[PDB]
């Protein structure tokens, strides 16, 4: 029972779409709270209006949970699942196990729904970090558990694709996108253990009534085992696109296949064993281990530092082929008329300030300046809410058509550029507002418009937060309008749904071979990564598990 021969031949196309759609739907719903949160940090309290529009909304904090959950968790995961399965499938021209692929979508959907109910009913106002003793409804923890576990299936699917391909090409190096996808999912698997453990050992039995107490330190230690790498789980799918698709859109090539492999390899190695950087201000964790994690965290910055050069060189290369002039001529030669190009390039621009923010946060002692302040949200909106999201948004211009056969008119294309610029601009203004107020000790996760006189010294940065909120409100609206206009038209060119993905060509060298070969020792690197995790977490976790001090749960909303 399938109406287009395109989906019978490429069924993975359909599954991919459902992941995407569900992903953006969650993005829209979660982002609605954004403008109001910005105004809040501009000292303006718009929540009564929101409450009038969305009656179910009971507080600032319930809205912040939905925001953090739907945007940072749901949207990102679904996008990942879409990208890091579909791209390697199309590159290999192999069909993913479809029984499993649909299974993973249903898990994500069912899990999302189940968790949505207690969130929407104010039964789970604990934020996207859900730190105990703060106790949510069981269906929040169960829903999340299922939703995340969906990824385990995704991992399998990709590994399967990879084994099968290695069988039909004995002695051939893993193709680039596939390689990325493989190290990606493997990394995620090792990363996910922290959360799984927390859920299985504490969270789930806690919320089902089996136990009455949960040790807060151990729960947050396990959380951040997963907590940091998850952001890379958000980042790498965009990276994948940036390395292998953006150069094409820019009219150039990826200047180095090995560089891209190395970057991804480093991430497999260094993504998980750095979680204490989220725990600098915690007690009961040895200061030496914090320093160790601090160093490992500065090392995990290396991959990004490489990416910066590799991508910039590829964009410079592309600009030159387009008739690039001098030091900055290449820049103007790029296709600023194409959103799929523009969106991610803007994201990368703001990523510079974003990354510098991270490195600061990473410097142990220096975290004490900014920890839990508005600086941190400032940092990450540059990272996830900007680069990842824009990339995701911009990829709609090649991806959506490739999946649906629906073309994009010139009007939509230009509508896209406006959304893109506004989103970016809005994000930049907010970044300045939150960083500034963060140095002025304004805390994050705070409804500070309810205490107007509490932060008088943040007068001017409050203005920027108001501005952004407006800017971004407009952009979001335009996105919704533009997104649906595309998904709600009946123009269907089935030929463009059958066109290949705009993968970029890769420039290779002589020395490549032996380095590339080394990197392709996946089984070896995996164990290596595994060993680092046991080395960085083992010592501490052992001591914590010997001295468990569970405390009772609380509801403070």
């Amino acid at each position: 029972s399938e109406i287009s021969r395109v989906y019978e031949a490429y069924p993975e196309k359909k599954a991919t779409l459902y992941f995407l759609v569900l992903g953006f739907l969650a993005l829209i719903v979660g982002s609605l709270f954004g403008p109001f949160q910005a105004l809040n940090y501009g000292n303006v309290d718009a929540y009564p209006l929101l409450k009038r529009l969305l009656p179910f909304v009971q507080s600032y904090y319930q809205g912040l949970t939905l925001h953090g959950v739907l945007n940072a968790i749901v949207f990102t995961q679904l996008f990942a699942q879409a990208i890091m399965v579909y791209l390697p499938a199309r590159e290999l021209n192999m069909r993913p196990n479809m029984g499993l692929m649909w299974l993973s979508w249903w898990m994500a959907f069912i899990g999302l729904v189940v968790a949505a109910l207690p969130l929407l009913a104010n039964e789970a106002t604990v934020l996207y970090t859900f730190y105990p003793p703060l106790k949510g409804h069981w269906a929040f923890y169960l829903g999340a558990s299922v939703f995340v576990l969906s990824t385990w299936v995704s991992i399998y699917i990709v590994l399967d694709l990879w084994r099968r391909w290695k069988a039909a090409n004995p002695g051939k190096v893993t193709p680039l996108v596939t390689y990325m996808a493989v190290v990606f999912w493997l990394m995620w698997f090792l990363a996910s253990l922290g959360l799984v453990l927390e859920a299985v050992l504490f969270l789930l039995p806690w919320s089902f009534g089996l136990v009455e107490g949960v040790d807060p330190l151990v729960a947050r230690t396990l959380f951040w085992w997963t907590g940091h790498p998850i952001v890379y789980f958000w980042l790498l799918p965009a990276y994948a696109i940036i390395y292998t698709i953006l150069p094409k859109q820019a009219g150039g090539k990826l200047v180095s296949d090995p560089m891209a492999r190395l970057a991804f390899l480093l991430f497999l190695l260094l993504s998980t064993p750095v979680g204490f950087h989220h725990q600098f201000a915690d007690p009961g964790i040895d200061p030496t281990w914090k320093m160790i994690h601090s160093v490992l965290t500065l090392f995990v910055a290396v991959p990004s530092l490489m990416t910066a050069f590799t991508v910039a060189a590829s964009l410079e290369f592309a600009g030159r082929l387009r008739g690039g002039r001098g030091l900055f001529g290449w820049i103007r030669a790029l296709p600023w008329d194409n959103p799929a190009f523009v969106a991610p390039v803007l994201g990368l621009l703001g990523f510079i300030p974003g990354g510098a923010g991270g490195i600061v946060n990473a410097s142990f002692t220096l975290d004490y300046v900014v920890h839990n302040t508005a600086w941190v949200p400032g940092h990450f909106h540059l990272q996830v809410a900007s680069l990842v999201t824009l990339t995701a948004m911009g990829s709609l211009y090649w991806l959506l058509p490739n999946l649906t056969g629906k073309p994009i008119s010139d009007a939509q294309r230009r509508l896209g550029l406006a959304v893109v610029w506004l989103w970016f601009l809005g994000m930049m203004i907010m970044a300045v507002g939150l960083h500034w107020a963060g140095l002025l000790n304004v805390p994050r996760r705070a409804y500070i418009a309810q205490v107007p006189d509490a932060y008088p010294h943040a007068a001017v940065p409050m203005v920027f937060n108001v501005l952004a909120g407006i800017v971004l409100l407009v952009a979001l609206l335009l996105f919704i309008y533009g997104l649906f206009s595309v998904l709600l038209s009946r123009e269907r060119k089935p030929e463009l749904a059958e066109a290949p993905l705009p993968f970029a060509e890769v420039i290779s060298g002589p020395e490549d071979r032996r380095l590339v070969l080394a990197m392709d020792r996946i089984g070896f690197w995996f164990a290596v990564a595994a060993i680092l995790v046991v080395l960085a977490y083992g010592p501490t976790l052992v001591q914590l598990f010997g001295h468990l001090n569970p405390v009772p749960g609380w509801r403070l909303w």
Binding site: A308, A312, E316, G326, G355, A356, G357, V360, L366, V369
Partner: protein
Amino acid sequence: EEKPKGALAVILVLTLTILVFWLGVYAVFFARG
């Protein structure tokens, strides 16, 4: 063609931005010590 002037210009901006952030906050750390 030749030396990546544009790419080097990018990673120069990045490097300087890193330095302003790090040394800017390294200063505040000691100012609040």
